Design a protein around this ligand. Sequence first.
Ligand SMILES: Nc1nc2c(ncn2[C@@H]2O[C@H](COP(=O)(O)OP(=O)(O)OP(O)(O)=S)[C@@H](O)[C@H]2O)c(=O)[nH]1
Ligand SMILES: [Mg+2]
Length: 316
Amino acid sequence: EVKLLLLGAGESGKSTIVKQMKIIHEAGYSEEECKQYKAVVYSNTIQSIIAIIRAMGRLKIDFGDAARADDARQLFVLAGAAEEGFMTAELAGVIKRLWKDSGVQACFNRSREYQLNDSAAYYLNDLDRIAQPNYIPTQQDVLRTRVKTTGIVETHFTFKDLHFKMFDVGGQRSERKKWIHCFEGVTAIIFCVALSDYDLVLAEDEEMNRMHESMKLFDSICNNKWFTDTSIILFLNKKDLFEEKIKKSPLTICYPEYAGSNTYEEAAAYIQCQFEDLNKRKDTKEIYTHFTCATDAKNVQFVFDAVTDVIIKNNL
Ligand SMILES: Nc1nc2c(ncn2[C@@H]2O[C@H](COP(=O)(O)OP(=O)(O)OP(O)(O)=S)[C@@H](O)[C@H]2O)c(=O)[nH]1
Ligand SMILES: [Mg+2]
């Protein structure tokens, strides 16, 4: 029996790690389960396109083609259908034309100025597939969904002859108060950090850098004596998004003293060091750091294999 607690700021990837466990260890979302996420996929897709359209007003970005102004009207008239799990051909076309507009694209590429789901491009690039008649979410479509965690989610699986129980709580500021309900009997903490959050600010507070907030939480948890004998595992998550992001958005927005290059390896290492240096007892307490892409089953499989090895060797 092994108890794992997923901790981390909102949108760090915790509940996506929980889904991956189910996919790799259990054996995938059945068709009935996938159909359940259909409305979440459509909801996430419509919320994303609306969020970009909303930001265009704040940021005074015009559509590239004026004809999109009528698509944007039709978008709101037809959007309620999507919430119910339906997607007409008319609604797909509207969203597609919007998504292809150069003004909409200009605003998409300015998304750190507002709040936009990580999976916006992923669904929006796949409209023709997700809008098809009788669409059923794939495993990846399910992994990509975004729903806020309220409460405490418990999942169970078997791996390497061990019974895992995995606990997942919300990481938004409003849910932090509930972390303490999970602190008993923990074999290991998996602390998730969104690597690509370095240039973002909190949904709950525009003046707080997302990665700074993540550092404060890690500092708190990592140095809590209650957890002296709990294995502390750090997942530096969203490394795929990070990779892309680091090429065009300076790390100095987050860490003004960063002197390295705008490259994946140097910047990833630096973030790791910033987090591991919050450890106040480095000679007595080890952090196990892994760099992850939560949505990628092959990455999470091999990483969780290594994590389990460590838990197996250290607890017993
Ligand atoms: N591209 C990419 N997307 C990811 C990765 N990890 C998570 N995501 C996506 O990020 C979004 C947020 O992930 P999620 O699992 O909900 O975070 P969370 O920690 O559980 O968020 P919370 O508010 O309830 S506490 C989801 O849409 C998910 O698919 C990743 O490694 N790469
Ligand atoms: Mg969660």
